[PDB]
A paper describes a structure:
The main protease (Mpro) of the betacoronavirus SARS-CoV-2 is an attractive target for the development of treatments for COVID-19. Starting from crystal structures of the Mpro in complexes with the Hepatitis C virus NS3/4A protease inhibitors boceprevir and telaprevir, we optimized the potency of the alpha-ketoamide boceprevir against the Mpro by replacing its P1 cyclobutyl moiety by a γ-lactam as a glutamine surrogate. In line with our original goal of identifying broad-spectrum inhibitors that target the main protease of coronaviruses and the 3C protease of enteroviruses, we also assessed the inhibitory potency of MG-78 against the Mpro of the alphacoronavirus HCoV NL63 and the 3Cpros of enterovirus A71 (EV-A71) and Coxsackievirus B3 (CVB3). Finally, coronavirus Mpros feature a catalytic dyad comprising a Cys…His pair, whereas enterovirus 3Cpros have a catalytic triad consisting of Cys…His…Glu(Asp).
Because of its higher potency, we selected the boceprevir scaffold, and replaced its P1-cyclobutyl moiety with the γ-lactam residue that was found to be an optimal residue for the corresponding S1 pocket of Mpro in previous studies, to yield MG-78. To our delight, the compound turned out to be highly potent with an IC50 of 13 ± 3 nM. The complex between the Mpro and MG-78 crystallized in space group P21212, whereas the complex with MG-131 featured space group C2. The resolution of the structures is 1.8 and 2.5 Å, respectively, for the MG-78 and the MG-131 complex. As in the boceprevir and telaprevir complexes, the α-carbon of the ketoamide warhead is covalently bound to the Cys145 Sγ of the protease. MG-78 and MG-131 make ideal hydrogen bonds to the anchoring points in the S1 pocket, His163, Glu166, and Phe140. In more detail, there is a strong hydrogen bond between the lactam oxygen and His163 Nε2, and a three-center (bifurcated) H-bond between the lactam nitrogen and the Glu166 side-chain carboxylate on the one hand and the main-chain oxygen of Phe140 on the other. In boceprevir, this capping group makes hydrophobic contacts with Leu167 and Pro168, whereas in the MG-78/MG-131 complexes, this same tBu group is in a slightly different orientation and interacts mainly with Thr190. Whereas the crystal structure of MG-78 in complex with the SARS-CoV-2 Mpro revealed an ideal fit, those of the complexes with CVB3 3Cpro and EV-A71 3Cpro demonstrated some steric incompatibilities that likely reduce the inhibitory potency.
Numbering used by the authors:
A (entry chain AAA), B (entry chain AAA): 1 to 301
Write the structure that this text describes.
């Protein structure tokens, strides 16, 4: 049946993206009800961003400084406030294409679909994990700020990410829709380091079930281990500790394949000590850690 | 700025997906104007599919055998015809969410976004290449038939794939919207083999430019080669021959990075003869061949 990195359909989110412009600076906004959310550095010049004072910059702006465009339709801004690092523009018209939506803050390890946008126009959609060090390995050009990360539960859009900035080596940082950064980052153009990144162990295990579901069985061994013995080896290879909550959450996949989680931990223990000896798993020469159990159940059922 | 496998936003296509049911058998349809396109084996029982006679099966059906559902709204079928392996249901209502659309037949090597659907409901979106042997490495469960492949040019949806069936090892086959199979395949449940798959050389080269754009330079060498010398080595590793049309098409990327195509061919020649000596390129331990030049320009500009 096959296994691909797969994103949520982007339609409901597409109908929310607008272009916010303040002077020269123009980026993307999320239009929900009568509010446009965007990163607050839309009110900066290239120089302000080297060491901004957003409060100072925003007092100086009036409602009229803000050009919001939804297609060929302008939008009268009739208010503005700043929630942490996001800007909130009250507008005369409520968005008729506003879906049921929630704002959530995701945990490191959870995945989400990025709708990458330029000039308030949907360009493309891909899947990302929130890394342990609170970065994402996205793909963002200049103009992509405002682009959002989301998940869908049935009809409800769970917005969890808005893109702000890029760190050394094409890794990325942003906020929830409360305007709170993920990780210890600030919307200021000064040297900031990420913190070492770990491998999301529960996610690798989820992917090995995907592999088995799909007929890749070669790594399966006749052993189990204890959580304790497994975590002593994993710690050495910079894998996250596997908790009992991780085991419980892997339950469905264990049930779908009839392979106990501690048997699959036996397989992973061996792959870390020996590598793959020139062997692939779902076509990858590396262990893949950006598929959650919830992603695997979804796509393999 | 980063480099991810990225799909077109799926909104315009989302508004076209319906559920077609004939007896027990129910799959997805594409609703465009007053026509619903779906795979023709919707009129089969599990047993008919072992050796169908579609003409015989379809004569027996009347317009009323066909249940088309668009949300909670049924749709009066008022006609039916069969174009090769696709079924065309004329319906009383033209789809108001019908985008500008084209039907195109893609070449092996070209990429497209799959909108994977179950019960006429968009489930997820991913990117695929048409392989040299006219298969795709998709992810499709039972119920996914009718799901479509597309590209977007500005406002125009270029529909090129409709999913029919799965071959040995989670590879997939389908038709254009004329109902013509890609590859030598038939919509019948009997043993069929794929034909050996080659590596899309021009696509690997496109991806190496992506790598260089993104700061992965380690494989860059001080050599050029001739097309001829390169194709003599590539032929041995089951890489497609690189044509002058391939070189011409790589032009923009060569221009964006100031690396001649025959210099990058010098790099690739070395990677095939030596492998990567435990080195990654954009995080991959393998050479990636499912990004077209047109995909790389897009995402790296
Ligand atoms: C901005 O949001 C936009 N309108 O697109 C933009 C996003 C993209 C620029 C290129 N890649 C992107 O992700 N964000 C910025 O330009 C932010 C903005 C100003 C600097 N900045 C950056 O992303 C810089 N990174 C940076 O300073 N990194 C450190 C690790 C902090 C040194 C830049 C050098 C431009 C990529 C703020 C307000 C942070
Ligand atoms: C069908 O379109 C649907 N309603 O979902 C379905 C698609 C998915 C089944 C599982 N994976 C899919 O991609 N297609 C079929 O069931 C088609 C259908 C009947 C058999 N068939 C298959 O895909 C089979 N493959 C097959 O027979 N492969 C050979 C190489 C030809 C032996 C099956 C064994 C069910 C996966 C036709 C009309 C071909
Ligand atoms: Cl993928
Ligand atoms: Cl990817
Ligand atoms: Na103000
Ligand atoms: Na105000
Ligand atoms: Na008939
Ligand atoms: Na008829």
């Amino acid at each position: 049946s096959g296994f691909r990195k797969m994103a949520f359909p982007s339609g409901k989110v597409e109908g929310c993206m607008v272009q916010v412009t303040c002077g020269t600076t123009t980026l993307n906004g999320l239009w929900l009800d009568d509010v446009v959310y965007c990163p607050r550095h839309v009110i900066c010049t290239s120089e302000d961003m080297l060491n901004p004072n957003y409060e100072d910059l925003l007092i100086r702006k009036s409602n009229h400084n803000f050009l919001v465009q939804a297609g060929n339709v302008q939008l009268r801004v009739i208010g503005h406030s700043m929630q942490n690092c996001v800007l909130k523009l009250k507008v005369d018209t409520a968005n008729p294409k506003t879906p049921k939506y929630k704002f959530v803050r995701i945990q490191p390890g959870q995945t989400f679909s990025v709708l990458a946008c330029y000039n308030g126009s949907p360009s493309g959609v891909y899947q990302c994990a929130m890394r342990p060090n609170f970065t994402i390995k996205g793909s963002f050009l200049n103009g992509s700020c405002g682009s959002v990360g989301f998940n869908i539960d049935y009809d409800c859009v769970s917005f969890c990410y808005m893109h702000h900035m890029e760190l050394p080596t094409g890794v990325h940082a942003g906020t929830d829709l409360e305007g709170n950064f993920y990780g210890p980052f600030v919307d200021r153009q000064t040297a900031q380091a990420a913190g070492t990144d770990t491998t999301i162990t529960v996610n690798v295990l989820a992917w090995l079930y995907a592999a088995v579901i799909n007929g890749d069985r070669w790594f399966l061994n006749r052993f189990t281990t204890t959580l304790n013995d497994f975590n002593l080896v994993a710690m050495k290879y910079n894998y996250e500790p596997l908790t009992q909550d991780h085991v419980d959450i892997l339950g469905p996949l264990s049930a779908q394949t009839g392979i106990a989680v501690l048997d699959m931990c036996a397989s992973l223990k061996e792959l870390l000590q020996n590598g793959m000896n020139g062997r692939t798993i779902l076509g990858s020469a590396l262990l893949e850690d950006e598929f959650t159990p919830f992603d695997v159940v979804r796509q393999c059922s």
